[PDB]
Amino acid sequence: MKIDVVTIFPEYLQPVRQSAGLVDVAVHDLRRWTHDVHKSVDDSPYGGGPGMVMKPTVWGDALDEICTSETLLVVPTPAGYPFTQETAWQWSTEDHLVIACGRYEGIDQRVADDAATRMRVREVSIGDYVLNGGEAAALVIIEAVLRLVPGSLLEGPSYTRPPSWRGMDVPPVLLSGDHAKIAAWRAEQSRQRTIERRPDLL
């Protein structure tokens, strides 16, 4: 798998040089494709309003150079479809991901619209909160996808040694050698924790 990340903060994605030569991850400074001596990457939004919108001419040139017809173009955005584990599984078999990191106010919509006439494009949000930029979302997506590269209910509490620590004992069932019972106990712990923390999953 090849992953190209485009960002105005290239140093952000250097740590995730975490291996083993199975994937290739390359980070590109978006300013490579700017046109002016000021290296401008955004401009005031049409229709008014706060913040800036990233320039289509800059992104268009960047994607033109980096993408191919086989590319899956990932665009993290707070207005995106949800990125889920199912999404990660799907993307883990792709030959080429390109992740376009932009500010939360967005990239000119015509960039994605144009790219979508030539390649597959996925606009996705990693959660119901707002980040200033796509870089952290890129990190999350890269981690979730790459750990799947062949290279329900919540999980309940986990325990390890020692059997007693600061007045708290490991649940005796876990030491019982009754593995059918252990499974049933873990199932109940999962049900209770899911009810408490994520009733939506039920």
Q: Which residues of the chain form contacts with ligand ABV (CB under 6 A)? A: 76-78, 102, 104, 125-127, 129-131, 133-134, 137
What does 76 bind: a second copy, ligand ABV, none (CB cut-off 5 to 8 Å by kind)?
ligand ABV
Type and span of the H or E element at 114: helix 109-115
Binding of residue 60 to a second copy (CB under 8 A): yes
What does 46 bind: a second copy, ligand ABV, none (CB cut-off 5 to 8 Å by kind)?
a second copy
| Binding to a second copy, residues 78-107 (CB under 8 A) | 78-85, 87-88, 105-107
| Binding to a second copy, residues 141-160 (CB under 8 A) | 143-144, 147, 154-160
Type and span of the H or E element at 15: none
DSSP letter, residue 107: B
Residues contributing to the annotated binding site for S-adenosyl-L-methionine: 76, 102, 125-131
Determine which residue in the list 37, 47, 150, 180 makes contact with a second copy, applying CB under 8 A.
47
Round to whole Å and give the CA distance between 18 and 11.
14
| Binding to a second copy, residues 112-131 (CB under 8 A) | 113-114, 123, 126-131
The DSSP line for 81-97 is EEP-HHHHHHHTT-SEE
Nearer to a second copy, 68 or 109 (CB): 109
**For residue 43, how many other CB atoms are within 10 A of its CB?**
14
Measured CA distances, 138 to 5, 123, 126, 187, 188 (Å): 8, 12, 9, 34, 35
Residue 4 Cβ, how far from a second copy at the closest point, in Å? 18
Residues contributing to the annotated binding site for adenine: 126-127, 129, 131
Residue 1 Cβ, how far from a second copy at the closest point, in Å? 16
Phi and psi (nearest 5°) for 54?
Answer: -70, 145
Nearest alpha-carbon partner for 80 in 133, 113, 124, 143: 124
